[PDB]
């Protein structure tokens, strides 16, 4: 064998696993399909901006541990956690109110929608602590549950906006239990949830953290080297790529679950990987940055995934400077809006911010990038209880890792780091046992 | 030089630092004065397994929770403090008892007033001086100073006194108000999460199991029962003198409790912050003990102010109830008030809180008189945060410093030790790599 460990995928999961493995003394190679590391995090420059994963918080043990580990610093996005004005669409009409006034409505709705989170996920990092209680509800979509609640249509519409934002899809495709999971990870507190999901970002960019972790390790890296076949025998794994064939005692498959079909495995992978590679998680929407000429202040908008007025489930202020306001925008379906068509985005903004002039608009297409085939991972109904454990399971000398199968903040950067660290430790232990 | 890194102290901070450094390829030696690793964590047996020091953890604690998951460890629950059935409390020399919810009405109203400014002082609890000016304005207050300015009943004030004395492990006028604020801010500004964070979850296999996993993931030599006496540094090396040998390294990580700083002779002498903290000490100076009573008392939680005429204990709560009766955890603000290892004295002291209990067993480790700790967990006195934290953390030549006593976040906790040790170990690895 040429290597002790080969890691397929150079996202945070694969990089963290490679650090764990190499620092334990194992000869490790990273094979990365793109011409860059980072995967679904991508720090670039527009005119330095984050084209993918962005926000972090100290409710996320691993990513915060690493940030402090390397002396990085964080800045604030203002719009979601501390807006001045809240705009929301209900029954195809647009309402606007002081943030406190809007959050009365939205928070009462939340009190209703999250009432069972404590019963389902008392230990958010131990998914199956309440296996029976979770199994009883895992068949519910976010919409299925919403419609059972005693709320006004307005409350339901705000919750629709919120849940569609969380799952990055229409609410009937997103698992209700996953919504509960987010709430429980935020210490069963709505303010803590807002602070955790869209407020703090690494001052020097996610790439700086990724690089600190890589420098802390001792792994070889081959970029622009897509893996095509993985063959496993009793002694080794043979990983075939477009640019060479490599052998290792153990291989950590750290690719997006939505891409599992894209490699030929012998033996074939278990039915859980096959089923999730077929169905995919729910993350399949649009995220974009919009520069507007006007100074609109700190706004937060809510619109149902399906409404007659705007394609955006939410838009909010990132920051306001001399050039106007930078907004972050989410939509549940790229069929609704071309986030890179400036005139289309401007039109889509008119009902929420009448009169805004779009100076610029950009969004990376994670859905059609063959190396992601989607955005951040949120399970569809039934997927947690059916597949999580089966997804994590090692198969022979093949190990599996990623936020897409993390126990806690699955779907976040923190999930990638947590899962990669544990899986790398397991791989090192396995090799020591032999 | 004999080593790249010598780590003085085999607590969680030093153990984490030693892992960080050795896994970076550096030849690392740990020197530990006691005959064991763990420092102020000590997993022992009381009639066959108890934690005599650091015990409770939570996922609001990034480093220790990261490590717990890293190694696949599990947690159990202490029931008494976070989910009692009955709360007993002492106010104005009276003892009241009520269903937990009723007691928490009073205690929670008091808390709502006492913590109202935490958000303004520590918006980023892991970044101590983010709001430096606001913190400097209040850092001169003791917990008692602030309490007496509040619009509360004497009952509310007495419950708050109990709580603040429990947190600081000392009398409330010795504890910094800002430190109380920090605990609240680290608990995400909500009392339920604070209760869950400070006394609820414990590692099923004991703190030593995590300490051992960290050590096994590393590659460092260990010398136990080898107290350091002198540390001398020049431009090229550090010479560390112990009772059992002399060792040299390019860099030395000093990971001892600040309360012990005076006990090693440093040449050149250390900066004024280290000396001032070794003189003044943090506030942690109380009693912690395990008590077995024959009776099944249920899940109780008690509150008594640090100075009261009824009992020496600031709080007692149920750890668990099994066939042998009730195991309770007891805290006192002053070792002069109760001999935690005198069974009859403890039984007497418990009578007003749990009238009729028969004490079958009682044990508490004396961290105050142990020369290797000289105190319990670190909570700063007034002024100490803003005057000393940064200078305490400062590297001096080839000397680096680490410990829970100087962490940015959960300072005073296991999480703080792991966090600070990781940062300092990474800094040492960087420094030594640069020299090559
Ligand atoms: C639009 C968007 C916004 C987000 N915002 C946030 C946020 O604010 N906060 C947050 O915490 N998270 C956010 N996330 C989620 C976060 O970015 C990801 O969950 C995390 O980066 C996933 O890391 P990973 O290592 O598990 O997988 P990935 O990052 O997807 O890494 C997988 C890697 O494998 C490579 N690969 C795939 N197939 C092959 C192959 N055959 N051969 C070789 N290499 C291959 C890919 O190129 C990629 O480099 C966001 C995600 C999206 C899509
Ligand atoms: C009673 C009590 C209860 C606690 N409960 C909790 C809890 O529930 N949860 C929590 O998170 N934290 C708790 N803590 C705090 C926690 O135990 C400590 O904060 C943490 O262990 C600090 O570790 P450290 O590595 O920074 O220093 P320490 O663990 O104190 O160890 C420093 C080491 O230096 C060694 N040393 C000292 N002098 C010398 C010398 N001259 N030569 C060589 N070695 C030397 C010591 O022997 C020791 O091993 C508690 C503390 C106490 C006292």
Residue numbers in the entry:
A (entry chain A): 13 to 59, 62 to 448
B (entry chain D): 13 to 60, 62 to 449
Pull text from the paper.
The first two steps in the pathway are catalyzed by the enzymes nicotine oxidoreductase (NicA2) and pseudooxynicotine amine oxidase (Pnao), which convert nicotine into pseudooxynicotine (Pon) and Pon into 3-succinoylsemialdehyde-pyridine, respectively. Both NicA2 and Pnao are members of the widespread flavin-dependent amine oxidase enzyme family. Enzymes of this family use a flavin adenine dinucleotide (FAD) prosthetic group to accept a hydride from their amine containing substrate, forming an oxidized product and reduced flavin hydroquinone (FADH2) in the reductive half reaction. However, our lab recently demonstrated that NicA2 is instead a dehydrogenase that uses a cytochrome c protein (called CycN) as a biological oxidant.
The crystal structure of Pnao was solved at 2.60 Å resolution. The structure of the Pnao monomer has a similar overall architecture as NicA2 (39% identity, RMSD of 1.5 Å), firmly placing Pnao in the flavoprotein amine oxidase enzyme family. The asymmetric unit indicated that Pnao exists as a homodimer with a similar dimer interface as NicA2. Overlaying the Pnao structure with the nicotine-bound structure of NicA2 reveals that the substrate binding pocket in Pnao is considerably deeper than that in NicA2 due to a replacement of Trp364 in NicA2 with Ser372 in Pnao. Trp364 forms the backstop of NicA2’s substrate binding site and forms hydrophobic interactions with the pyridine ring of nicotine; replacing it with Ser372 in Pnao allows for a more extended substrate binding cavity that is presumably better able to accommodate the more extended Pon substrate relative to nicotine. In Pnao, the aromatic cage residues are Trp434 and Phe470, which are more typical residues that compose the aromatic cage in this enzyme family. Several of the aromatic residues in the substrate binding site of NicA2 (Trp108, Tyr214, and Trp434) are the same or similar in Pnao (Trp113, Trp220, and Trp434) and may promote the hydrophobicity of the “aromatic cage” commonly found in flavoprotein amine oxidases. Ser372 is appropriate positioned to form a hydrogen bond with the pyridine nitrogen of Pon, and the deeper substrate binding pocket due to the presence of Ser372 may allow aromatic stacking of Trp220 with the pyridine ring of Pon in Pnao. However, the isoalloxazine is buried in both NicA2 and Pnao, with the C7–C8 edge of the isoalloxazine >10 Å away from the protein surface in both enzymes. Our structure of Pnao contained oxidized FAD, and it therefore remains possible that a change in conformation occurs upon reduction to the semiquinone that occludes the isoalloxazine from the solvent and reduction by dithionite.
